[PDB]
Each structure stands twice: as structure tokens, then as C-alpha cells.
Homo-oligomer: A and B are copies of this chain.
Amino acid sequence: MKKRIIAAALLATVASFSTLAAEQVSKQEISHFKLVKVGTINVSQSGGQISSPSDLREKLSELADAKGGKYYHIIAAREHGPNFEAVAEVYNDATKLEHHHHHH
């Protein structure tokens, strides 16, 4: 797919920005700030649905959007065999969805 791949002949491959996707709260923030727990989401797909760590989170936010949460606190993650299981409980900040421009 596409052209120009660039082999590993370049010893130094540096990339800044690249539009990050970082957004979640840990056990501390939940207990400290007292967030709004909006339920639970869990991944349970057949093996090759997740080709990389990128795939995983793309399916996590996918479920989070359907829920209407702002963060998800992952509690369990294992391969249960041919199926991959990742369980995360969903939290919102102090209200329903911060940053009032993400509606689609």
C-alpha cells in the first residue's frame, strides 16, 4: 500500500508529533478526584481482530464512544484462547464529556 517505504538502512529514524492519542486516568485520579463511573466495556473478539496494540485501543475508544465516557480503566487483559479479552470500566470527568467539539 502506497509507495516509498524506507528500509531499516537509516540508523536514525525520528518522528515528532504524529498526532498522539493519549487520554485515560489511573487508579489514583479516580480515587482522588472522584470521577463519574459510567459502566463497563470489554473486548472479546476472535484473535486476528487485533493486529497490533494500535488496533486494540481503536476498539476500546470505539466502545467508549458508544458508551459516552471520557476514560476507561483497564482491569483485565488476557488471551482466553482463540479469543482476546480486555476488560475496562468506563469513567467520565465530572460531567458528560469534556471538550464540547467531538460530536459526530
Contacts and interface: CB of A to CB of B under 8 A. Distances in A.
Secondary structure at chain A's binding surface: helix, strand, loop or mixed? Answer: loop
A2 B101 contact: yes
Contact of A78 (B28, B61, B73): B28
Taking residues whose C-beta sits less than 8 angstroms from the other chain, chain A's interface range is: 35 or more
Nearest to A57: B23
How many copies of this chain are found per oligomer? 2
Interface of A: 1-2, 4, 13-29, 32-33, 35, 52-54, 56-57, 60-62, 64-66, 68-78, 86, 88, 90, 93-104
18 contacts: A15-B103, A18-B103, A19-B102, A20-B102, A21-B64, A21-B69, A22-B24, A22-B61, A22-B69, A22-B70, A22-B71, A23-B23, A24-B24, A25-B57, A28-B74, A32-B78, A53-B93, A53-B94
